Write a protein that binds this ligand. Structure first.
Ligand SMILES: C[C@H](CC[C@H](O)CCO)[C@H]1CC[C@H]2[C@@H]3CC[C@@H]4C[C@H](CC(C)(C)O)CC[C@]4(C)[C@H]3CC[C@]12C
Ligand SMILES: C[C@H](CC[C@H](O)CCO)[C@H]1CC[C@H]2[C@@H]3CC[C@@H]4C[C@H](CC(C)(C)O)CC[C@]4(C)[C@H]3CC[C@]12C
Lengths: 238, 10, 238, 10
């Protein structure tokens, strides 16, 4: 049975997610419009840049994150941002569609669309397969937000100083998640192990995105299509 | 260094 | 009577302008959409960033520009780009409207719209007054493109090394323009002097834009709305 | 320094 403290953590993570995932997708009309080889890059760079702002907002409300040093906060967001975006995008992904549905018809994204932004199928094929594997787990929203927080608060990320402080934060969240699944998720005996495997999947996806981003960022006619916030977060400065 | 990130983190 | 060499200069400048001013304005649907205090900044930053690319294309076809060193080319574009954009925008400005009409209704710009991108009336009031004063001159297209080239090739700009080389280029263009007006422009005895006064007007407008841009660029929630190419060209690096 | 400008100037 979960304690009040463990329950307060769940409450605060759910509220944080609800404050920064917009189910109406109303901001997408603000992006440079989609065009359907690099024709989707303006739209999808704007989309990812928007999502980064949402991940930053979410992170700032994870209990303990804001007390870390500014350097550790930056280090955790720079290495985990693409992973959190992939994770949080599962709530618009559909097994029936194999697509991300974000409101209107202009903002439904195939595999055909997302291969038109400078990235190839060696990133996009594992990403789609990760989405369906994750969707099939049928996570409660409590499990979904806990996984995002655990992913964000991984101490084995380049640039973090206070390893022990953030590992302590992560272990607390892991404890919450294991107890949640045991008490509240019928048939979830194997679920925690599968969720941890998805964290490994994300590391692999992160590596492939980072390798391919280096190609874009070295071609100035492509990098000039990105946003300042994307250049900062996926850039190599320390 | 990380001017926008610092601002967004408050 | 104009020589063949002076005539070849006019031909090449007109062709250069026709290659990089798109009378159909078809690319404007690619920008982040207008929103009608900072609500026009995404759209107008995209608009200005697009215009910078066009000015670079124009500059690369001015006889003599491409033979300057890469540093001098960068120095001339960084100090003159905003002036060339203001100048070239006169071909969509209307005395009847006091607006810039760029194709469809979403891309007609009032004084009300262009005050919604972080800049105030101490830039926008002189800019509009400059537009009507320029429009009233009824420049031939030959005079218009020559003025843009002369403005671009001003040696009294910060960062230029080869002053004497680019002053020589500018004097040639000035000679062309004075002879053009005398032979081909009826009633143009006072025109060259007025065009030179507009170059002074642009310096003042440049100074005010640069001062106000510093405000935007120091606020990261605003500068993050700009494009990488805008940050490069209006930035202070040497 | 001026990475995009250099590229656009060829
Ligand atoms: C459309 C979805 C988001 C749906 C959400 O519900 C909306 C709220 O976040 C995103 C998620 C992962 C994204 C891909 C990640 C890898 C890569 C990043 C790259 C960004 C760049 C160019 C900076 O590397 C752009 C192209 C992709 C393939 C992304 C496409 C959009 C996806 C699927
Ligand atoms: C709408 C017109 C362009 C019409 C052309 O025919 C289209 C092809 O170029 C532009 C010209 C000057 C622009 C202003 C310059 C000063 C300032 C720059 C600033 C750019 C920033 C934010 C980087 O400082 C955005 C806001 C303005 C006022 C510009 C608005 C659009 C105008 C009138």
């Amino acid at each position: 049975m979960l304690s009040d403290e463990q329950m307060q953590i769940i409450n605060s993570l759910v509220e944080a997610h609800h404050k920064t995932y917009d189910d109406s997708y109303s901001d997408f009309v603000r992006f440079r419009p989609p065009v359907r080889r690099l024709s989707m890059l303006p739209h999808l760079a704007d989309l990812v840049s928007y999502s980064i702002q949402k991940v930053i907002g979410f992170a700032k409300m994870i209990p303990g994150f804001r007390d870390l040093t500014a350097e550790d906060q930056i280090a955790l967001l720079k290495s985990s941002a693409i992973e959190i975006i992939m994770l949080r995008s599962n709530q618009s992904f559909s097994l029936e569609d194999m697509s991300w549905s974000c409101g209107g018809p202009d903002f439904k994204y195939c595999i055909n669309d997302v291969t038109k932004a400078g990235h190839t199928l060696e990133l996009l094929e594992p990403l789609v397969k990760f989405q369906v594997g994750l969707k099939k787990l049928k996570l409660h929203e409590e499990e979904h937000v806990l996984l995002m927080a655990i992913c964000l608060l991984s101490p084995d990320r380049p640039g973090v100083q206070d390893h022990v402080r953030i590992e302590a934060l992560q272990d607390r969240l892991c404890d919450v998640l294991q107890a949640y699944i045991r008490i509240q998720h019928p048939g979830g005996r194997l679920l925690y192990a599968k969720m941890i495997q998805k964290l490994a999947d994300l590391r692999s996806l992160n590596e492939e995105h980072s390798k391919q981003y280096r190609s874009l960022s070295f071609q100035p006619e492509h990098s000039m299509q990105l946003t300042p916030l994307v250049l900062e977060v996926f850039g190599s400065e320390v | 260094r990380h001017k926008i990130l610092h601002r967004l983190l408050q």
